[PDB]
């Protein structure tokens, strides 16, 4: 039950989102627009079909995405620091929410309702 040390129950997102996010100044809003490429566009998550709402599974997914990234990276002597992580959470929240909001929408649209 392990894909990368233990994430063997997790699934891997649609690879389709990287929103612009706005910290309230172009100080770190810009830093991100020059630092967004490195971040995973993908997010690691679990089937919301099983959950009362995706938000619980999103907020898990955020932590796990960062982890599934950094874990494979610090295996290479790398390390990540809070101000890097804060530049993923802004997006990885959006991306995991949006992946969920297509996996749990664009798969059923009310189970064959549209």
From TrEMBL:
One of its GO terms (molecular function) is type 5 metabotropic glutamate receptor binding. It is found in: Cell membrane; Golgi apparatus. Residues 82-100 form the Prion/Doppel protein beta-ribbon domain. One of its GO terms (cellular component) is side of membrane. One of its GO terms (biological process) is negative regulation of apoptotic process. Keywords: Amyloid, Cell membrane, Copper, Disulfide bond, Glycoprotein, Golgi apparatus, GPI-anchor, Lipoprotein, Membrane, Metal-binding, Prion, Repeat, Signal, Transmembrane, Transmembrane helix, Zinc. Belongs to the prion family. Its primary physiological function is unclear. May play a role in neuronal development and synaptic plasticity. May be required for neuronal myelin sheath maintenance. May promote myelin homeostasis through acting as an agonist for ADGRG6 receptor. May play a role in iron uptake and iron homeostasis. Soluble oligomers are toxic to cultured neuroblastoma cells and induce apoptosis (in vitro). Association with GPC1 (via its heparan sulfate chains) targets PRNP to lipid rafts. Also provides Cu(2+) or Zn(2+) for the ascorbate-mediated GPC1 deaminase degradation of its heparan sulfate side chains. Monomer and homodimer. Has a tendency to aggregate into amyloid fibrils containing a cross-beta spine, formed by a steric zipper of superposed beta-strands. Soluble oligomers may represent an intermediate stage on the path to fibril formation. Copper binding may promote oligomerization. Interacts with GRB2, APP, ERI3/PRNPIP and SYN1. Mislocalized cytosolically exposed PrP interacts with MGRN1; this interaction alters MGRN1 subcellular location and causes lysosomal enlargement. Interacts with APP. Interacts with KIAA1191. Interacts with ADGRG6. This is Major prion protein. It comes from Mus musculus (Mouse). The lineage of its organism: Eukaryota, Metazoa, Chordata, Craniata, Vertebrata.
């Amino acid at each position: 039950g392990s894909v990368v040390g233990g994430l063997g129950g997790y699934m891997l997102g649609s690879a389709m989102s990287r929103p612009m996010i706005h910290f309230g100044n172009d100080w770190e809003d810009r830093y991100y627009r020059e630092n967004m490429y490195r971040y995973p566009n993908q997010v690691y998550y679990r089937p919301v079909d099983q959950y009362s709402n995706q938000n619980n599974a999103v907020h898990d997914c955020v932590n796990i995405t960062i982890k599934q990234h950094t874990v494979t990276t610090t295996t290479k002597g790398e390390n990540f620091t809070e101000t890097d992580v804060k530049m993923m959470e802004r997006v990885v929240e959006q991306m995991c929410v949006t992946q969920y909001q297509k996996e749990s929408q664009a798969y059923y649209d009310g189970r064959r309702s549209s």
